[PDB]
Symmetry: D2
Subunit: 311 residues, 4 copies
């Protein structure tokens, strides 16, 4: 009759571990930590299982390197793929050199999902998001609504945090949308932010924040990734990306119909088609139940056309 939700984390790196950790303490469902190094997933799995006993939670975490174990998964969250190039210096390679290898990686994962988890809600994190997700949509052959990219929730939440940290208010009430591509071409709609429905321009007229501080926030939102790549020294952000993915996986598993900015396959929205792109959407039991097409200005539309053409 009923059964536990099954989430497969294709990639048990830094992001994968925190994702399993959160989902288990929230009892969102059983977790499969799939990694090409199986003991890495088995280590976090067993470790998180010891945490469940500490936290009195009932669900199970598994580690594996075999695609048979992600079978019947309701959600597949993908972080696998190349992130670094050890045998070359920082000067001999750019990010464009990993796109093609990662593209083939996205296919192998897609075929196995199509094989073992034909009904899975595929959330992708591997970057470049807007391109990598499109590789999964082809490989999985799933409908438009069951293949989503994670971003915009991370990008918008970062924008809303910087706003909240300045106003000294609970970020629960700072809403905002950062759209476009999940990269340096994103569009932080910082002047459309709202504080519990209150337009941000009000707080400008009050002196709580300044137009200059907003423009600088939009710029720090664009480089938040690299900012943390330089703070960590070795690696990138993972705590917040993990929380974003699990928040999207819960909106699906629980049919919350939450409004999240996600990378979505377009077929006419904003004047584009056949491309993934960050945009607010309604995530529910059918995945992307609805795309909210924002009313952009000519300047904001130009910025959107620019990131689409670099995707």
């Amino acid at each position: 009759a009923v059964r536990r939700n099954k989430i497969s984390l294709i990639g048990a790196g830094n992001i994968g571990g925190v994702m399993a950790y959160l989902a288990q303490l929230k009892e969102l469902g059983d977790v499969v930590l799939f990694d090409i190094a199986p003991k890495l997933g088995e280590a976090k799995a067993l470790d998180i299982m010891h945490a469940n006993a500490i936290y009195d939670t009932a669900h199970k975490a598994i580690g594996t390197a075999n695609y048979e174990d992600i079978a019947d998964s309701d959600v597949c969250i993908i972080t696998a793929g190349l992130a670094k190039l050890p045998n070359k210096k920082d000067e001999e390679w750019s990010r464009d050199d990993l796109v093609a290898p990662n593209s083939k990686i996205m296919f192998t994962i897609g075929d196995n999902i199509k094989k073992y988890a034909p009904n899975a809600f595929v959330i992708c994190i591997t970057n470049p998001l807007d391109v990598m997700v499109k590789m999964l949509l082809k490989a999985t052959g799933f409908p438009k609504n069951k293949v989503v990219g994670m971003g915009g929730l991370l990008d918008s939440s970062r924008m809303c945090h910087y706003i909240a940290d300045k106003l000294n208010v609970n970020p629960r009430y700072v809403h905002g949308s950062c759209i476009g591509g999940h990269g340096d071409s994103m569009i932080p709609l910082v002047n459309h932010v709202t504080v519990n429905g209150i337009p941000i321009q009000l707080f400008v007229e009050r002196g709580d924040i300044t137009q200059a501080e907003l423009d600088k926030i939009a710029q720090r939102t664009i480089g938040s990734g690299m900012e943390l790549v330089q703070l960590y020294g070795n690696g990138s952000a993972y705590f917040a990306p993990a929380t974003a993915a699990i928040e999207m996986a819960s909106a699906y598993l629980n049919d919350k119909k939450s409004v999240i900015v996600c990378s979505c396959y377009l077929e006419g929205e904003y004047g584009h088609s056949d491309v993934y792109l960050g945009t607010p959407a309604i995530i529910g039991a059918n995945g992307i139940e609805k795309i909210i097409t924002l009313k952009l200005s000519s300047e904001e539309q130009a910025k959107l056309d620019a990131s689409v053409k670099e995707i």
Copy 2:
């Protein structure tokens, strides 16, 4: 050097019972179910205490009719209950003045914007420590009706219903937002009509009376109790939540010496700030007409 949060509920009625229940399962702190009918508070305490053992929660709730038991309370929510009710507020606030001289006083009794003023004068506390519960109930009601129509998680539907907690409230429907997106966009896409948005404004005004006639006896209590606990949590935990509630004004909106529902930041200092919304002449007249009713 650490201590449990203490929440006194002056009034163990239907609202009081749900408040103690939510606070005990959330482990928000100890609860004192104060009521002139001492047994009623004792019943729900022992019943909620049975819930704690089921739900594996550690805090304790008690029932009493002695103000000596609300001593050192961090929060005092009042549901006990115009002229005679006003007098009841002075007796409560005068005891809070003595036993709970540091409590964040939240008022539920109606008329809200008047009773809370009688608690402010009796307790002698500064204005930033005596707040009233309205607007958070009134705004969430509005946000629901819009979420239900849009079929969206109300988590992302924000809105402000200002004014007095009565028929003169001002549901700012046309300023509602969905994940920051203006509500007008959803009108321009067919998801909802301005006519339906105007209908939600009136339903919000009359939501209180709608449930009175649905219940047949009594009124709402699940949502009021839930809002009072959220306000009490933003204080105890210093969350600094933007919550619309009845605040004492000394100039804001052009009014003084009157309690009025406006968005504000609730933190460790109770009301740390008041957010004076930028109102149109259409909204000011509605506000000025609500102050006159108060």
Copy 3:
């Protein structure tokens, strides 16, 4: 293309509440705030709509996403994963059939949790009316009775009740057997605390006697009506164990077919609740003096 239909692969859990009384209202409240699933408040009377609309207002306050409705029509129970029943011996028994006949028609795959008293008698009337397997028709009582026993101990020991575990078995009534001498505190037998001086055997014996009359103790305290906050928490705690397949160890009224020497009678006993409802019945090793109190409980049932 047929693997790419606009058909949802997941659903919200659906919990129907037959009886929107004081317990029904708290059950809908707790379930909604925990985002456990949609709730259907069913009652013969507006009473279910009032609590639903008021609890939906609470959802907007608490940023919770699930839905609650009121109704007086079994049609809104269809496809419910869980049916919890509080409406309500002879007249109650007949009421339990009508409910059971509709739960069979509309919610043929529901996990039926009974609360109406006499628990052990009403839940059996349900089992016969729905015709479901015995493992999907359970009665709530031992989790309430046991937790009450554990609170009285935790209250005297000044310990978190999260670590106080104990079993109260038998029938949901004066015949219940609260095994106070077997209570454990984070695995530690309570006898140790007796040796430490934190509690006396006399107090333990008296806690057993207070657990039995806890129902009436709150009736006199309430003056009008019985307890409801805890019976609601217990019920939702069990529905959550089913909807989430927690394999939770819960004392509850189960249909026995050999255990404890009895058969064809509902009797409270520790069990394991999961996606199959009652997945295992744990039979406790009873003493001679305890098997006697158990045999008396079945006689009264």
Copy 4:
């Protein structure tokens, strides 16, 4: 009048990272990530982004200056024998100076030895210096719960003694919602020969994950444990937790930390619960105290 809790973590490593994450998402209080290195600011900022997603209110900051520990309600230690013993004193001397009312929760290994160094450095009372017990005991209950296939929420157990190979997994005293584990042995769900091995696996669990991880050791469960302990102190839960406590006569020993059940509340160690042991179990405890 009131105030956020101040939970400072001396050590922004893997364990320290999961701590801030769990504390922030649970809104248990403000978090401070201290470390010799940027390591704290990275996780503080990364976790601050997570707050905005999870709609949580509290704040986290990284730092490398003990001045940011001032007035900390809790100080959880993971930085790091003789060398790491000097660090405990350096750490303790700062907790003494900036957070003199802090509830100290040590994790650095050897637990029972490193925590005493903190006790003598901070100079705090007996009850305000604990050592994270809850990990070892919970590991035992997981393996039993995994075999029995029951919610570990209802499996209680106590793994007493030192936090090393000399620990005592009391696998035979385990209870399932108060039901003795022997009933499940007579039930067919498990065998005594399997419980004896669960004790061994519990002893070597810390080393099992070091080999699985390959690089470094466990951190998810160790982090969850100390946050539970810190939550039992800040919320005055008076919860029963197995943890390292400074003894003064208990079990026939004194002037030594040792893993034992205890009550944790607003006063830290509210009470030590001395378990009723046998001759075989006391000899193991005596063999552990000597190794500490």
